[model samples]
Target chain A: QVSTEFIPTRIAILTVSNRRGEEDDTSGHYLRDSAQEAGHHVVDKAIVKENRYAIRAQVSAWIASDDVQVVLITGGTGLTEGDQAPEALLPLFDREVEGFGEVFRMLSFEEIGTSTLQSRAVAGVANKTLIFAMPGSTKACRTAWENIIAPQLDARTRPCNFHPHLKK
Target chain B: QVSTEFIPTRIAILTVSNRRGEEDDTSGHYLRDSAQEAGHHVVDKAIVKENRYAIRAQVSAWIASDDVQVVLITGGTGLTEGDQAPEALLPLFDREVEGFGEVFRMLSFEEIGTSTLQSRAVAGVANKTLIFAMPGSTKACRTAWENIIAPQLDARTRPCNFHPHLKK
Candidate 1:
């Protein structure tokens, strides 16, 4: 299922961290830049503290937005008490893209070795919107974006990608 | 958190396949043998056809079992009309061990290359009983069980594994 034309996807960026914001969100910043560079739209962006309810509210709103086709999340994907991204976002998944985390970790293993095991990066779809919850590290975010995410978001990715779902 | 004492987990094996039964369930047989060799007890086993409702019925029964501490399922993980293992089971997850599929694929990739991407091999905690839905093949089942599920099922795996939760 190779797409003939490049379809621009509308994306939302959220950074989950108690200490990071627009000024300090290097990961969220890179994600935004990467998507745009890959010829997609960055419709909205935000940085939230570690409160699960608060984090859930922000992404929930963005996911329900008709204009928001995809969400790129950075931060809070760990085993710490504050690592609530998986808990906050997983329940919202209508269907998880299970392959994403596998592919991401495989790419990470090349650079980080066995230490990559601790990362809790995740991605799934909710209410027709795709949510990609990734590691908080700037390097990990960059790695996820550059290697796995960039091409997948590009409508030109063969054997089908997330393009068709965004249309309807 | 390596366990001081070995704790043998009670497991149930269910094969979600249409064309295989007791006479031809190689994947199911292999899983049973491997888990037994690894010191886990196989309390029960069965083969059910690919109907989502039937698949759910069989697994839900095992999930509610006191004797069955974990369920190892094989088949229906592909992108086909009959591939419904993921659909039948994912919604039952109380909390998904998302890294299971990632690590499974990583180990599988070494031997199977890009073909591993098609598998929706998933594991999670449901009703306090761990459930692992894996691809249906002798080799893939072996790959999933040995390199990924074995160490995690073992009580002695460190920094932490799923053993502690199983004992209670």
Candidate 2:
């Protein structure tokens, strides 16, 4: 039997990039592998274009589905015009984890200094599903998963975690 | 007649600290003065103890009133046990400006490096009013105001700003 103390969340990941295919989507692969290694199930994963609606459509499907509890989005969260992850996902949020982007950038600043400001990494809850959006780099994905997302998603994490807010 | 280009916002400030008195309340004064100098009116200001309810009550009063369009709170936005600004005010938010804290920490990292992680600065919109909370340092207040709040509050600023969201 699975350990009673450890609760496995059903997670989905979306890589929002037009240029990168499955062969070069390192960030997408990192998120899926990281979530699985942490004892969460990667129920679904996809790579969409940089367009706002395109990104929103894929994420919205997961938000409305019964299988997905969390969605990890990597890419299109930068300052450039094509960067639209925040715009795509924020409107669907019932309430945001406002501290996510701050903590992400704080950790990122340790590795990239002021350049972290260009990142618009964001996270929130929609229809009982947790959605996290981050910059499109394997390193950035790794930093977010290891530092912020993993701990929050863990039921065994001290004090409290996002498990109570998510589907059982 | 005043220029139509400049739309001065009506701003309020709250100083959330128990240790600091009026004589040593440098951060509060810094925010009030900074907003006024930026052409916004400082409609109200106060110094509240670090209790969560006390902080919430004061901010709730502003959020209910028509006179206050923006609220700038300084202090109790750190990792310390007494710091409870985020917990106090987040429930009141209709929507959070998720990027505010990220940008604040990113700017702080340029000056303070990894130490910025301890500061949990945050901002959001509550009932058409903007709320920004920052660390209890004069330098941190200046950094948030000069870089983020001022420009966003300015109607003349290119692209989009928060002016339209506030009451006329």
Candidate 3:
């Protein structure tokens, strides 16, 4: 149920947004830094527009790669017409980490209350790769990474963590 | 947007367990009473053993009923060999309310940390009928109902809720 030492995970970062660029892509930036700070490797990174097909294609390629063990996606997970991360990604999941979106909103609710309902953030596993899509806000990414992803990815987390479950 | 008037929802309760019955089914009892107390009608209730087919059949029957607007299910959502509610129910969902399980576990974590990961609680829309499956424990049911379900079922929760989305 637990591991004795730290295991580094290979992570990819994707930002789905129409307007934000590398300069303003704080969410992606934070995810890249956070994953690396946690001792994981940032294998790849990209920024895609709001097109579901575009977002899906980028993610599909990462999961298809054996080196990409985890993917952190931010943006296009809202109720707005442009927000389509859940729709684009759900079909690809072999099994959804169902608790991801729920826990994300629960953490979000502590900061934003009922307004968190509009967020469609999601996570799941595809081709032995773990994928998580969170809200675009820098703060939302921080919350998800710090509280959920960080602990789950750390092999040292007790009882059970996503460490041993990753492709070995 | 918020609703000006409260709209009562018609709900069904299903308890999936191999061991409990009407006399000691605290989770189901609490749900039935909670739904009724919250101004929703408990249109139908049942207790099924831990067979995936039986669980699916009972829930499918409720969603098929025009009178059953929502189904609140308890049990068989854990990581055990017999815990198969998610498998039984996920295929039936037209669109998963991806946030329900996340929020449920998030609230659950406040009460029971990493152990919350073992719970596969989930919710979604099946034929326009809202369905929620939670951990079998009475406390898990209470955490789900009080923090997440009760408010979402209420018409006046806030900027967005599952109220108007229910089938007419």
Candidate 4:
């Protein structure tokens, strides 16, 4: 039972990397296409330098602007030295939305087993904006957004949803 | 495995209320005594009005100060109109420590059943200060500190502890 005039949500698709270029950016392209397929608006898309300052600047800009409501950053969410996505965005978060990481690992456990512990995927809010950091893989991106982020982002979802908090 | 020279953490106890006096604050008294018994230093204690702005102001000030490393607040965390303890302290937190509420309910479930949902006991850090908000009941305060807070606050507890993050 969806509404006829569906309100489109403005989503920012960000890719943080040191190697992948436009044509090789599989995860970014996947998220962009999926977001559109789900009837949400992808207002802005870009690839930022892997440095913390660069990633922080991009995410912070989106949070400050009204054009972007949700930001999905794909890549650099691992335990390696360059995996500073969580570290960069965490300081800017206004509140840590619990269960996002826990649920991500819980859902990924069946597929990756103990290896899922290496994924540091996380989500939180900053300046009334929601940011999600996911692994740099198409399958992980699809699984995370389709199973968790998509439903939670929808206004029609059951008992409660995150859309209500997006209002000014 | 505990260190003998380790000085107990200094925590400030605050009871937010509009009617209750110093002597009648059983919840605050319970937390203070339990913290002291656990070898934690109860540096300061006070009873403030149940105003959202007031609670936020007091807790924020304590968190900003060097003397108060932890602040355990009691009362005004509920669905009621005046219960703004969670809202006030939540935004100020740098990281929202999840599972605190989950474990709290799991423990409280045996004692209070489904009514435990009404108790919004939460913990987090603000300006590098740890803050825990619990129900006004003495039992909840006693159980929360003894079972959860005390162990985590200790430096030699396990593989990792809150002591490392307690400073900054």
Candidate 5:
């Protein structure tokens, strides 16, 4: 099922927040644009309540749906009381892709110093869905997808790639 | 709650298999011996059925319980149909400590070559419980826990340690 001409990876964008709506989701907008520009299909997008139960239900549904191959979630990965995206999604992931967080922080450190330590961005696979949780900032979303995820999701860009592992 | 006398950290030993019994659990026994030798506690232990549900329930319970601080599981972390330890416990983890796997394969590759890819031995934490799932071999368990896990679990270890992160 591999294609050569940038065969659009299907991605589902989830913006986890308590107060933001679609119109106010700048991070989500940035991610949608970046993913589209990089040749990925933004199949579905939504803003979910930050409550663990709500986020869990939304993420679990997206992961189970065949139309969604990847789910990129922004916001709620922090030390605050409302930061529950990682916790909510952790139980649904089949394999925690640990390197994503390490590389993200390592890369973010180069830009933001030790403040990057507070960001708990993570990535993993659940069922067949690849999920990436990033900090809320538009810049962080841009950096995560553009510099790290985009190239890895592409079929032609490496000695190896995650596309080869995505089995539906 | 910290000490300098090399007190062994509490470890929970779990044996994952449908067929293996207490009499045949040489790998688990080896891990117990190694932990004791390193001055760590094998707080509680169990031999669970190979079902993913059973394994997850047991390991998650151990990791969440106050009596157990670290869990070392043997067997079922492989590519075969019955091997699901990685899938079972992976979701329960809040943060996957990736260096364990990277360093593990680095050390294991020296001895086993590409075959090491089939061994998906993983480690992570849920709540405050540190869990490590290793191949069901006496030698592999010995190497992972003794050489790698022991020092990381120690609080007095030079530059950094896993103990600091274990306390939430």
Candidate 6:
């Protein structure tokens, strides 16, 4: 049975970096670590290149899977030519949790000032699964997981949360 | 001749309210006035009910037109059951200007505190025309226009601006 305040749904994660993998991806490590610590499950994890089509292939497959409920993508959310998370991920969204990026930057502004504008952190719903794309910094990952994603993923966050919106 | 710094854009506007009209729809008036003051032209304006489909029809019609370069909508961007701006407008976005809503709330937070979370202000490029869904209050319209939308629409805004994004 699901916990009253949380839904331990099956989740997938992708660390998008042409040069980093499981051994060196601190952002990915922190994200998977935080998800497990929060009482959720990570059914799959991957490391892919910064290529948009490649990233889209990785994400599209996971979202289409019947078992995955959420996908957390870490990396490539920026203005750089190689930052393709928004371009790759946004088109797949049937519904966007639009407030996530707004609220994330709002929370981040305290720690990073105007630099927060560089973060293209984004989240949306695709094939009934929630997909979040965050910047590739461990600090950005820590803040996103700890402050915004953690609470929003929970069902107990006052007015609303993403739990009910995850699957149905 | 149009100034290179700020193009005198042909804009359309809508007030998504059932009760407010020409006299009471102060938000609508304020929006058009500010647009004209800033050297943009208001090609059309209207007050419609909060019905999502009706609102969508008006937006779709304007976006389809060759002359309408911007669509500014005020109202129906709250948590209330009838609040439908996000649902009605976001799907039309070719690329959602994700930071607009974030920046709007970031600015509004100074005045309204935590209550700013209830705002669902959104903006995007639709058919290469900029479309923004703002809250009904004139104050929100003013800030959404003056502080955020106005400068961003200009070609002179230093590092970057949305002037080049608007299509021919």
Compose the digit string of candidate 2's lDDT tens values, residues A1-168. Answer: 223398999999888888899999888888888888888899999888787646655765676567899999989998899897887667657789989998998999999999888889999987788999989888888899999889888887877788788855
Question: For candidate 6, lDDT tens digit of each residue in B38-112?
Answer: 888899998878866566657766765678888999999999999888886776566798899999999999877
DockQ for every prediction shown: 0.02, 0.01, 0.01, 0.02, 0.07, 0.02
Instruction: Provide the lowest-lDDT 10-residue window in model 5 chain B.
Output: B57-66
Error (Å) of candidate 2 at residue B92 is 0.8
lDDT of 6: 0.82
- CA lDDT of B23 in candidate 1? 89
lDDT score at residue B38, model 6, on the 0-100 scale:
82
Query: What root-mean-square deviation over C-alphas does model 4 reach?
Result: 12.0
Per-residue C-alpha lDDT of model 6 across residues A25-122, encoded as one tens digit per residue: 99888888889998889999999878765675567667656688889998999899989889877766777988889988998899889999997988
Model 4 misplacement above 4 A: A1-5, B1-168
Question: TM-score for all predictions?
Answer: 0.50, 0.50, 0.50, 0.50, 0.52, 0.50
CAPRI grade of model 2: incorrect
- Local lDDT at B93 for model 5: 73
Stretches of model 5 off by over 4 angstroms after superposition: A1-168, B1-3
Candidate 6 regions off by >4 Å? A1-168, B1-4
Off by over 4 Å in 1: B1-168
| Candidate 5: Cα lDDT at B42 | 80
- Chain B TM-score per candidate, please: 0.95, 0.95, 0.96, 0.93, 0.92, 0.94
- Poorly placed runs, candidate 2 (over 4 Å): A1-168, B1-4
Query: Model 1 over residues B1-168: C-alpha lDDT tens digits?
Result: 687887899999999888897989999999999999888899999998786656665776666555778999999999899898898788666789989899888888899899988889998887678999999979999888878888889888888888768725
- Compare the candidates by lDDT and give the number of the best one: 3
By TM-score, the better pick of 3 and 5 is 5
